[PDB]
Amino acid sequence: RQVVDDTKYKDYQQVGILHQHNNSGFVGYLAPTMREGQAYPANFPYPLIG
Amino acid sequence: TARGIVTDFAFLSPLASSAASRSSARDDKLTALLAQLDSLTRELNVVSQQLLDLRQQVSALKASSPP
């Protein structure tokens, strides 16, 4: 597999689990609870295609 | 490499953080004090044994020259 190359990427940002918003407004915060939050573009999966 | 995110519900729980701090303080006290006391007791025992042996030798030497 391949992952983000933190050294060579210009705008790398080591983002912990606490601050990754994907599927926001549709999944509970860090726990299999009910949905919460608002829709928003996302931050975490760093794209490796396109 | 770096690996730790376990602080999530630690941030979500102030009491857990306080208990962890108390545990750290108790671990510090136990480890440091017990290690220091054990090393000191070992050193004191060795020195006392050597001192007793030397005292015996000095007593013998004193007895073996009756001025």
Side-chain angles (χ1 to χ4, degrees), chain A residues 14 16-18 29-31, chain B residues 2 5 7-9 11-12:
Chain A
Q14 177 175 359
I17 274 72
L18 312 188
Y29 185 58
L30 313 185
Chain B
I5 27 73
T7 63
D8 40 54
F9 273 62
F11 132 83
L12 279 181

Coordinates of all heavy atoms in Angstrom, one line a residue, chain A residues 14 16-18 29-31, chain B residues 2 5 7-9 11-12:
Chain A
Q14 N -0.3 16.3 10.3 CA -0.6 15.1 11.1 C -1.8 15.4 11.9 O -1.8 16.1 12.9 CB 0.6 14.8 12.0 CG 0.3 13.6 12.9 CD 1.5 13.1 13.6 OE1 2.6 13.7 13.5 NE2 1.4 12.1 14.5
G16 N -4.8 14.0 14.2 CA -5.3 12.9 15.0 C -6.7 12.5 14.8 O -7.4 13.2 14.0
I17 N -7.1 11.4 15.4 CA -8.5 11.0 15.3 C -9.5 12.0 15.8 O -10.5 12.2 15.2 CB -8.7 9.6 16.0 CG1 -8.2 8.5 15.1 CG2 -10.1 9.4 16.4 CD1 -6.8 8.3 14.9
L18 N -9.1 12.7 16.8 CA -10.1 13.6 17.5 C -10.6 14.7 16.5 O -11.6 15.3 16.8 CB -9.4 14.3 18.7 CG -8.7 13.3 19.7 CD1 -8.3 14.0 20.9 CD2 -9.7 12.2 20.0
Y29 N -19.8 11.1 17.3 CA -18.4 11.5 17.5 C -17.7 10.4 18.3 O -17.9 10.2 19.4 CB -18.4 12.8 18.3 CG -17.0 13.4 18.5 CD1 -16.2 13.7 17.4 CD2 -16.5 13.7 19.7 CE1 -15.0 14.2 17.6 CE2 -15.3 14.2 19.9 CZ -14.5 14.5 18.8 OH -13.2 15.0 19.0
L30 N -16.8 9.7 17.5 CA -15.8 8.8 18.1 C -16.5 7.7 18.9 O -15.9 7.0 19.7 CB -14.9 9.5 19.1 CG -14.2 10.8 18.6 CD1 -13.2 11.3 19.6 CD2 -13.6 10.6 17.2
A31 N -17.8 7.4 18.6 CA -18.5 6.4 19.3 C -19.7 5.9 18.4 O -20.4 6.8 17.8 CB -18.9 6.8 20.7
Chain B
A2 N 5.1 7.1 15.1 CA 4.6 7.7 16.4 C 3.2 7.1 16.5 O 2.4 7.0 15.5 CB 4.6 9.2 16.4
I5 N -3.2 7.9 20.5 CA -4.4 8.7 20.4 C -5.3 8.4 21.6 O -6.4 8.9 21.7 CB -5.1 8.5 19.1 CG1 -4.8 7.1 18.6 CG2 -4.7 9.6 18.1 CD1 -5.5 6.0 19.3
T7 N -5.6 9.3 24.4 CA -6.0 10.4 25.3 C -7.4 10.9 25.0 O -7.8 11.9 25.5 CB -5.0 11.5 25.2 OG1 -5.0 12.0 23.9 CG2 -3.6 11.0 25.5
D8 N -8.2 10.2 24.1 CA -9.5 10.7 23.6 C -10.4 10.8 24.8 O -10.8 11.9 25.2 CB -10.0 9.8 22.6 CG -9.8 8.3 22.8 OD1 -10.2 7.9 23.9 OD2 -9.3 7.6 21.9
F9 N -10.8 9.7 25.4 CA -11.8 9.8 26.5 C -11.1 10.2 27.8 O -11.8 10.5 28.8 CB -12.5 8.5 26.6 CG -13.7 8.4 25.7 CD1 -13.6 8.5 24.4 CD2 -15.0 8.3 26.3 CE1 -14.7 8.4 23.5 CE2 -16.1 8.2 25.4 CZ -16.0 8.3 24.1
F11 N -9.3 13.0 27.7 CA -9.9 14.4 27.5 C -11.3 14.4 27.8 O -11.8 15.4 28.4 CB -9.6 14.9 26.1 CG -10.8 15.5 25.4 CD1 -11.1 16.8 25.7 CD2 -11.5 14.8 24.5 CE1 -12.2 17.4 25.0 CE2 -12.6 15.3 23.9 CZ -12.9 16.6 24.1
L12 N -12.1 13.4 27.4 CA -13.5 13.4 27.7 C -13.8 13.1 29.2 O -15.0 13.1 29.6 CB -14.2 12.3 26.9 CG -14.5 12.8 25.5 CD1 -15.3 11.7 24.7 CD2 -15.4 14.0 25.5

